[PDB]
Amino acid sequence: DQAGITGTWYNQLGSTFIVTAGADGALTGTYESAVGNAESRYVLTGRYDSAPATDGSGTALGWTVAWKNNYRNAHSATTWSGQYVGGAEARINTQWLLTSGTTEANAWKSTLVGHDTFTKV
Template identity: 30%
Template sequence: MDLFLLFIALSVSLTTITAHQESNSLKDLLSSGKSNRATNAACSDISGNWYNQHGSEIIFTPGAKSSLSGTFASTVSLYKNKRPTADPVNGKLVGYLQRDGSFGFAVIWDNASNQTTAYSGNCYPDENGEILIAAWHLAEKQHSIGDAWKGFRSGQDIFTRRKRLHHFS
C-alpha cells in the first residue's frame, strides 16, 4: 500500500505540471462554464467502461468508501516502441474517487512484472456525458541503479465512455 501511495503522490505532482502544458484545444474543451455543482453531479460515479485516445479500455468497479478497483487493457505497448498493438497489455487497478470528480489509481501490469503505472486526474461533464483527463507516470525497474533514470515515462490520456475505432498496422 505504501508503494501505491507513493505513486499517487508522484502522479498528483505530474498532474500539476501537466496542467500548465495543456493545449489550447484541451483548454477550450474544459472551459464550458459548468459549475462545480454540475461537475460533482455528473462525475460522482465513474464506474463502467472508459476508452482513451489509443483505444485502451478501463473498467472501473466502485468499492467501499470511494475506493475503485478494476482492469486496464492497454493497446499501447509498455515497451520501447510505444506503438499501438492489437493484443492488449492487461493490468489490475486500485484507487480512489473523490466527491468532486478527482481520482487516482495505480495499475500493476500482468504482462510486465517490472512495471507499474500511476494515474491521477479529474472528471468533467461534457455534452456527451463525462470525460476523464489524467496524467500518468510509468515506472519500470532497471537492471542497475545507474540506469534507474531510464525507467520513467509520463504522459496524459483522455478517456470517454465511447469506444473509438482504431487501425493497427
C-alpha cells in the same frame, strides 16, 4: 459521481479502462492497453473524491496498474492522476507516470510521463 465513474472507458490509444467506483472512495477494475508490451487485462485499484465540490469543478481521482498478469510481466507500473468531468460528453482527463524497475545505473531513465483522455464512447 459513483454512477458517473463506474463503467467502461476508452482512451485516445484505444485502451479500455473498466472501473467500479465504491461509496467509500475506492476504484477497482481492469485495464487493457492497446499499446506497448502488454496483453489482455491487468488489475487496477485507485481512489476518487466521493464528496467533490459543487462549484462545477471536476472530481479528482487516480489509479495504479502493475503490468503483471497471467500472460506477461513488464516489471513496471503506471499511475494515472486526473479528474472526472461529468456531462453529455463525460471525460476523465489524466496525466500518468510509468515507472519500470531498473538498476541504480538506469534509474535516471526509469519513468515515462504522458497524458490520456478517457471517454465513454
